[PDB]
Amino acid sequence: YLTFKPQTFTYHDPVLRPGILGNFEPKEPEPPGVVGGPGEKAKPLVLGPEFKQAIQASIKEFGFNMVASDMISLDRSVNDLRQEECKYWHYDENLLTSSVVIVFHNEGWSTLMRTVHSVIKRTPRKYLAEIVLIDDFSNKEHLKEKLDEYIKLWNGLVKVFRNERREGLIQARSIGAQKAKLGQVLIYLDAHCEVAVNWYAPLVAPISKDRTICTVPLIDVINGNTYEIIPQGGGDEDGYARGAWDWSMLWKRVPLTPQEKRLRKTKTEPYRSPAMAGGLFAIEREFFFELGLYDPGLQIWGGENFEISYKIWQCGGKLLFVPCSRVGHIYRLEGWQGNPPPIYVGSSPTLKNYVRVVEVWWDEYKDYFYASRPESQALPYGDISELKKFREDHNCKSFKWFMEEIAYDITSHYPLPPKNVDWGEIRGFETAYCIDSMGKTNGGFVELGPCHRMGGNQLFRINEANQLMQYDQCLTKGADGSKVMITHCNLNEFKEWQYFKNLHRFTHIPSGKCLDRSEVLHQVFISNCDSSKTTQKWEMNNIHSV
Amino acid sequence: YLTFKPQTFTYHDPVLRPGILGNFEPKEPEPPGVVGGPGEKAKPLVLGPEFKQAIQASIKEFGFNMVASDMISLDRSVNDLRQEECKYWHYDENLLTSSVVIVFHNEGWSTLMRTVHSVIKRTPRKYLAEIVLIDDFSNKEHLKEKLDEYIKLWNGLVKVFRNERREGLIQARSIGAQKAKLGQVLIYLDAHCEVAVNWYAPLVAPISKDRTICTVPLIDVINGNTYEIIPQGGGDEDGYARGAWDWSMLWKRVPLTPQEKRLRKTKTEPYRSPAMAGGLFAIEREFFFELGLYDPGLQIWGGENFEISYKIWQCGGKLLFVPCSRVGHIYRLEGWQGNPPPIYVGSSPTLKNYVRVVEVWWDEYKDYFYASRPESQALPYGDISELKKFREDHNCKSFKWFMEEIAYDITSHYPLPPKNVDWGEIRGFETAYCIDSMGKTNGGFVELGPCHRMGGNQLFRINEANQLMQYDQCLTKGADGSKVMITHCNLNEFKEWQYFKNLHRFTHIPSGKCLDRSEVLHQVFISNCDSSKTTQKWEMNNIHSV
Ligand SMILES: [Mn+2]
Ligand SMILES: [Mn+2]
């Protein structure tokens, strides 16, 4: 019998007037930061080789090409990745104000401040209540004091709040929502973003008609080396994807569906997505709290993005991607360092997070997740009570309802997994050797190695469909060898293993051959079944992580 | 008319006496270094997770699990990987003495001292003239003074010489030859090796019959994490491989041939290899100087291994692998750092080294190397006069003889490559966008990126066989997409492109379709040929590295 607070704000959905510009379209072309290079207007900035050593050093420190970034104007003009039809929407002007919160940890100076500059440059002043920077316990000296003094440039409009300890990314956003009090909606941004022209009105309009709508710009790709901005490769013939997952809860994208397109009169208006990537979005501040906000249990990574997506949909709100609001996100390069925290197992902490989201929201579907990740069944996921009560109190709808009403396309791209027959290490019987992937993928060969009971590349599972899998991969027979190979798997591919626990036998089905090894050297292969050979006896043992 | 000095030593090949042990077989099993754990007798040493933070730290520093190595005795016993027949050879005792030289740079203390301990432990005292460690300009403090003082343990048998500048691996071995004066034969050893039992007599017997024979132990794999010792995966039913290369001059191994076995009375006696891996070998010391020794133009990491192999074979010597002489070599783990020198620009010096070797030794076969690596064609490879005069003065045989008489099996595993039609960047006509691999391999999809004219992943070559190649990979059509994929390539696979330079066109032969691009999307695909579309117009420009 708990409900969200009713719409009191009146607002009119925008109107498309083909051939007429405005009202939030800039009248004239955007002034460059520097006439007329470099990095403008998002032209690629190619450097080196006189720079290559400085570039690599900065990549190690930041994951981005900071000597390139450092010569691009903080106020640089950008390419326009939106469709033409976007320019002919007329919007109320009666929009709710916003606090954009930006969480950063050790972010480079020029990438942090260009995010800030971009938002100041391309957002109507009257709607920008504040830009709140949440320092999640950085140690780099340029972010302290230097930042304090510089920030005075905006007469208090930009404020920073330090964290005493490293709260990690999810809880730092929740801290953000508490420390950002001036605006009516919270707009979250990564600290390495550039916001496109007339990004605000499209993004905040739907929230203005209906406070329980949560909004997501289309997230474009800023090349972390050369800084030109590219849309993502998404399904739609127009580039529109909706956010999705597979049944290990890995983020996936699928194309905009014809069903959703029949719901929409226009090509460019908002559209329903089952989930959001996580870093960039807008909610009405009160609604976030009614939500609220992110489950406190969630540790440093990773979403969180699904938890908030499910709450919104299943507790009566909406999640909309807004084609006419676009934001570029810089994507990391290899070479970063760039390092996890020391925890045990920790669980891992992020795995523990998936279990929290699944156990409170997925109902019967937890089965598909424990099939994809049995190693996670017996994990100490922590206290879930208040989250379960919240869902009952607000009479939230079932994950079945959610899968069939708003996420109906997912299972056509990521089909439901078969139940497991058994999972764990594949150990040679009465020995200390384990089949182990070496992390090989997509055609490599699987080896023998000393058992370490740590799961990971020594963890397998076997399907009711006769699939021997690690992660999203399967093992099959690599012709012409007798070698066992790991490749990408599809629902009816490589259904070729059957395991006889009592027999200590894995037997390849198309041949008659058994699973075999040589203990020196560390070799795994199939050969003609022979009950004498102890090299064809295996046990499959659950590896529990505490 | 120049000749190598004649054999003056009289020595007789050993004799195989099935059922009778000795004479260099240890009489009684090897005393462990520590009764009875850990590391003995090369049992794998599995640690953590209480150690995992300290292990990862040491892998970063050294590339080996040094916490594990540090708890294994320097005098540990080891598993015996040689075949049984090996223990029944009877050797004359009339063998040459040896200086073993170990070149090291920043090696971990316990891996370095276990190499030495191992050599001291399993080598008959009377043949071991000295162990010369060559410090190639290390900075780590354990390696100096602590090293000088420890080394007194052996009363001057072991000695270290410091280099004033980092000479690199190849030139450090040459300094070794010069500072290691006592032994009749030089035995080179990596600073992370463990020599097997009775490694010495099998390895030095052939050189004692014949001073122009250069000898190579079978190099076994010491696991850098758990330290158990495994033989290499190698062709022969017995695990015997011979050393080879592809026509880019990458090291390769091929199974021992039936031709070589008809030449051999025994399963276990030495056999011919066309090349050595490079780190571990034995030559008579004068003979190496007569070869004189490693071309001095080779910079740090290069095909020295190939250069000494061709010299030995084409100038009248022999290179033999010795099944009864085995040495374990620790193989690096990911996570090391582990870093190249700053000298720009190029592949660079190492590619320059390939060119020196090829230009002096491969004769007409240089064409195959340049088809594999056209980017090297116009490289300033340096003065090669004296090397060419050496080959002429000593009347060395042709590379054509070598390929047809002693390396007769290579083209059956790595076929001669077709000539190139063209090579270079694949640039969009009158654009600054280039096809580029992103380093993707074996199934990945090639993309468009900003041209940088630095080669590498933006470099391609097209075959006279209609193959579009980067490295060892080829581009083909990824069903069901219209995307262009990169995969592993075989002589008659994916013969499916034709490049018209004047037409600026790349056309896919099976379909009719033209290579096409988006630019805005950074996308490379094939679509139906349309002459109006400039997105289907491409140039292939040589990229020159100076
Ligand atoms: Mn991010
Ligand atoms: Mn090495």
PDB file of C-alpha atoms in Angstrom, chain B residues 61-140:
ATOM      1  CA  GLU B  61      58.798  -7.181 -10.396  1.00  0.00           C
ATOM      2  CA  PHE B  62      60.292 -10.321 -12.025  1.00  0.00           C
ATOM      3  CA  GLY B  63      57.757 -12.152 -14.182  1.00  0.00           C
ATOM      4  CA  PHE B  64      58.138 -15.232 -11.986  1.00  0.00           C
ATOM      5  CA  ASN B  65      56.394 -16.210  -8.772  1.00  0.00           C
ATOM      6  CA  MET B  66      59.361 -15.317  -6.597  1.00  0.00           C
ATOM      7  CA  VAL B  67      57.587 -16.004  -3.308  1.00  0.00           C
ATOM      8  CA  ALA B  68      57.241 -19.608  -4.478  1.00  0.00           C
ATOM      9  CA  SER B  69      60.810 -19.783  -5.825  1.00  0.00           C
ATOM     10  CA  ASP B  70      62.154 -18.328  -2.577  1.00  0.00           C
ATOM     11  CA  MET B  71      60.803 -21.268  -0.522  1.00  0.00           C
ATOM     12  CA  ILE B  72      62.224 -23.972  -2.845  1.00  0.00           C
ATOM     13  CA  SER B  73      65.785 -24.997  -2.002  1.00  0.00           C
ATOM     14  CA  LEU B  74      68.596 -23.784  -4.228  1.00  0.00           C
ATOM     15  CA  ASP B  75      69.814 -27.432  -4.088  1.00  0.00           C
ATOM     16  CA  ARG B  76      66.479 -29.098  -4.735  1.00  0.00           C
ATOM     17  CA  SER B  77      66.229 -32.416  -6.516  1.00  0.00           C
ATOM     18  CA  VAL B  78      64.275 -32.523  -9.788  1.00  0.00           C
ATOM     19  CA  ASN B  79      62.176 -34.883 -11.870  1.00  0.00           C
ATOM     20  CA  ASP B  80      63.954 -36.870 -14.583  1.00  0.00           C
ATOM     21  CA  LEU B  81      62.394 -36.220 -17.992  1.00  0.00           C
ATOM     22  CA  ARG B  82      64.869 -38.194 -20.107  1.00  0.00           C
ATOM     23  CA  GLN B  83      63.892 -41.499 -21.619  1.00  0.00           C
ATOM     24  CA  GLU B  84      65.149 -44.681 -20.042  1.00  0.00           C
ATOM     25  CA  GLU B  85      67.539 -45.460 -22.878  1.00  0.00           C
ATOM     26  CA  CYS B  86      69.482 -42.369 -21.967  1.00  0.00           C
ATOM     27  CA  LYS B  87      70.794 -43.959 -18.781  1.00  0.00           C
ATOM     28  CA  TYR B  88      72.633 -46.711 -20.675  1.00  0.00           C
ATOM     29  CA  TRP B  89      75.126 -44.669 -22.710  1.00  0.00           C
ATOM     30  CA  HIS B  90      78.810 -45.175 -21.905  1.00  0.00           C
ATOM     31  CA  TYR B  91      81.022 -42.132 -22.518  1.00  0.00           C
ATOM     32  CA  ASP B  92      84.794 -41.972 -22.831  1.00  0.00           C
ATOM     33  CA  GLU B  93      85.674 -39.530 -19.965  1.00  0.00           C
ATOM     34  CA  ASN B  94      87.992 -37.916 -22.404  1.00  0.00           C
ATOM     35  CA  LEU B  95      85.665 -34.921 -22.710  1.00  0.00           C
ATOM     36  CA  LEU B  96      86.466 -31.257 -23.145  1.00  0.00           C
ATOM     37  CA  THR B  97      86.244 -28.935 -20.158  1.00  0.00           C
ATOM     38  CA  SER B  98      83.696 -26.098 -20.148  1.00  0.00           C
ATOM     39  CA  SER B  99      83.097 -22.552 -19.022  1.00  0.00           C
ATOM     40  CA  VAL B 100      79.379 -22.108 -18.389  1.00  0.00           C
ATOM     41  CA  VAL B 101      78.428 -18.467 -18.929  1.00  0.00           C
ATOM     42  CA  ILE B 102      75.179 -17.053 -17.553  1.00  0.00           C
ATOM     43  CA  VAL B 103      74.204 -13.587 -18.719  1.00  0.00           C
ATOM     44  CA  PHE B 104      71.766 -11.948 -16.343  1.00  0.00           C
ATOM     45  CA  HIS B 105      69.921  -8.658 -15.944  1.00  0.00           C
ATOM     46  CA  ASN B 106      67.988  -7.912 -12.741  1.00  0.00           C
ATOM     47  CA  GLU B 107      67.346 -11.619 -12.155  1.00  0.00           C
ATOM     48  CA  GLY B 108      65.727 -12.710  -8.922  1.00  0.00           C
ATOM     49  CA  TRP B 109      68.274 -13.918  -6.396  1.00  0.00           C
ATOM     50  CA  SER B 110      66.911 -17.403  -5.873  1.00  0.00           C
ATOM     51  CA  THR B 111      66.306 -18.159  -9.536  1.00  0.00           C
ATOM     52  CA  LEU B 112      69.844 -16.974 -10.361  1.00  0.00           C
ATOM     53  CA  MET B 113      71.532 -18.918  -7.581  1.00  0.00           C
ATOM     54  CA  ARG B 114      69.502 -22.069  -8.238  1.00  0.00           C
ATOM     55  CA  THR B 115      70.805 -22.115 -11.815  1.00  0.00           C
ATOM     56  CA  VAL B 116      74.357 -21.998 -10.471  1.00  0.00           C
ATOM     57  CA  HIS B 117      73.668 -24.410  -7.616  1.00  0.00           C
ATOM     58  CA  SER B 118      72.095 -26.791 -10.114  1.00  0.00           C
ATOM     59  CA  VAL B 119      75.159 -26.587 -12.409  1.00  0.00           C
ATOM     60  CA  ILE B 120      77.489 -27.154  -9.455  1.00  0.00           C
ATOM     61  CA  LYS B 121      75.309 -30.019  -8.232  1.00  0.00           C
ATOM     62  CA  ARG B 122      74.981 -32.116 -11.377  1.00  0.00           C
ATOM     63  CA  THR B 123      78.200 -31.448 -13.221  1.00  0.00           C
ATOM     64  CA  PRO B 124      81.351 -33.528 -12.730  1.00  0.00           C
ATOM     65  CA  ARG B 125      83.823 -31.236 -10.982  1.00  0.00           C
ATOM     66  CA  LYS B 126      86.717 -32.040 -13.309  1.00  0.00           C
ATOM     67  CA  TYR B 127      84.958 -30.759 -16.460  1.00  0.00           C
ATOM     68  CA  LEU B 128      83.664 -27.529 -14.883  1.00  0.00           C
ATOM     69  CA  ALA B 129      86.435 -25.009 -15.461  1.00  0.00           C
ATOM     70  CA  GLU B 130      84.529 -21.943 -14.127  1.00  0.00           C
ATOM     71  CA  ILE B 131      81.053 -20.421 -14.010  1.00  0.00           C
ATOM     72  CA  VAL B 132      81.172 -16.895 -15.437  1.00  0.00           C
ATOM     73  CA  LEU B 133      78.188 -14.697 -14.597  1.00  0.00           C
ATOM     74  CA  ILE B 134      77.864 -11.666 -16.882  1.00  0.00           C
ATOM     75  CA  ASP B 135      75.974  -8.802 -15.255  1.00  0.00           C
ATOM     76  CA  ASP B 136      74.442  -6.760 -18.068  1.00  0.00           C
ATOM     77  CA  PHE B 137      74.079  -3.538 -16.097  1.00  0.00           C
ATOM     78  CA  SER B 138      71.531  -4.586 -13.444  1.00  0.00           C
ATOM     79  CA  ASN B 139      70.222  -2.050 -10.944  1.00  0.00           C
ATOM     80  CA  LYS B 140      68.727  -4.306  -8.258  1.00  0.00           C
TER      81      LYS B 140
END
